[model samples]
Target: QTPVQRALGLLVHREHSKKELNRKLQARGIEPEAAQAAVERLAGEGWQDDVRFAASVVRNRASSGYGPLHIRAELGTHGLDSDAVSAAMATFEGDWTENALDLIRRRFGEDGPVDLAQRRKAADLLARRGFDGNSIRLATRF
Candidate 1:
């Protein structure tokens, strides 16, 4: 099958980063030149877009209660560079502070960190989840 054909099969599973598609094509024995052409063609036809892919990743991670830091790092694995992170951040509509507070409530039986230990625990939990220090502090304070 053609590189585009194989790439289409992969795309049906999940939106692929351009680099991811190219890597898969090369692994399947497609020639480098052919893979490059296929990727360019697909992108020209709107079938491939790093920005869109990054946006989708950000949305998915955020929905799973991840913060911007984790989402950006995950996008990094998808071959999205610095500008791609900015684009993804622009597309994130949820409030990180709110999410952190909600998570604190869920984890702390709705008292939401009434003591020093509970506050520390809440901060650590959000930090481990990739939330920013500001968001963690805001969440743990009340």
Candidate 2:
């Protein structure tokens, strides 16, 4: 298949970073140079966009309760560059405060323990979801 055809196929499955598309094409036996060229061409035509893909992933993951770290790792897995990832993250203006409050409320409820053990459990849950130390601490305390 032509490079464009292969790229389109990959995109059909889901959005992909240019780097990811190039890697997939090479894996399929296409030459590196040809794959690079195809990716560039597609990008020029607006058929491929890393920024859009990154934004989509961030929004989707965050809504599902994924923290920045988890979402960043997922973006890396898709071959997005650091700059692209940063740009996507900048677009994420989520109300983490609200989400954290909701989580704490749901897990502990009104009568939940305020002891160290309960605090630890709440902190661990947020940490596991990839929240940073500061956010986790604030979430548990508030």
Candidate 3:
């Protein structure tokens, strides 16, 4: 199939970063030059938008209980540059601290992290969930 045809099929399943779609197109044995042109056309036509792709990533990850840190790194992996990544982050309107608190409550209890050891556990959990230092501190408050 043509690169555009394959790319359309791929995008039908989920939004893809420009880089990700290019890579997939190449993986299907499309020529690099052809793949690049196909991606350019798709992007030009609004069939593929890096910003929209990044926004969807943010929404999906945030709702999946990931924090900004992890989400930022994930965007990077999708080949988004720092500026695009930050722009995508701006789309998230929810408070990271509140999200962390909800996770803490769900994982621990309504009171959340009562003891020093338990607090440490909650902090670690938040860190693993990609929460920032300030959010973890505020969310895990005793």
Candidate 4:
């Protein structure tokens, strides 16, 4: 199939950032310029969009137990502009603190952080998940 055909096929199954789709086309041996233009066109056609992609990612990852920082960084890797990034970050549903609380509960269970060591563990996990220190602190305490 043509590069665009394959790209459409891939997108049909799941959302992919333009950069991700371009990279896949390249990996399949599509010429660099050809792959780049085709992907860009796809974006222009509204068949692909960084903002939309970012929203999907933020929604899926946020719901899947990730924090804002983590989701932001993942969106960064997609090479989207700041506006799209901001828009995507803004798409986070629910109260941010509450989201963190739920994630904390899932990761550590009902007893939560029982001690300093456990608190540290929770902080580290939140840190890796991209939560700011303040949010992490609140999540641990709440």
What is the clash count of model 4?
A: 1
Task: Look at candidate 2 and give me any clashing residue pairs.
Answer: none
Summarize candidate 1's per-residue lDDT along 66-136 as a digit string, tens digits.
88788777788877779878978899788987887788887886768888988888887898889998898
Give one clash count per candidate, in the order shown.
0, 0, 0, 1
lDDT of candidate 4 at residue 121, scale 0 to 100: 88
What ranking emerges by TM-score with the best candidate at the front?
A: 4, 3, 1, 2
* TM-score for each candidate, following the candidate numbering: 0.76, 0.71, 0.85, 0.87
Per-residue alpha-carbon lDDT of model 3 for 42-113, expressed as tens digits? 888878988999999999989888999999999999888999999999999998888888888888889888
* Candidate 2 Cα misplacement greater than 4 A, ranges: 73-83, 103-121
User: How much does candidate 3 score in TM-score?
Assistant: 0.85
lDDT winner, 1 or 4: 1
lDDT of 4 by residue, 22-133 (tens): 9999999999999988888777777877667888998888777777778878888889777888988887657666777888888788777888888888988888878777
Span of ten consecutive residues with least summed lDDT in model 4: 91-100
Error of 3 at 49 (Å): 0.4
At residue 75, give the lDDT of candidate 4: 85
lDDT for model 2 comes to 0.83
In model 3, which residue pairs have backbone atoms overlapping below 3 Å? Answer: none
Candidate 4, clashing residue pairs?
70-130
Candidate No. with top lDDT: 3
lDDT of each: 0.83, 0.83, 0.89, 0.83
Q: Alpha carbon lDDT of residue 45, candidate 3? A: 82
Higher TM-score: candidate 1 or 2? Answer: 1
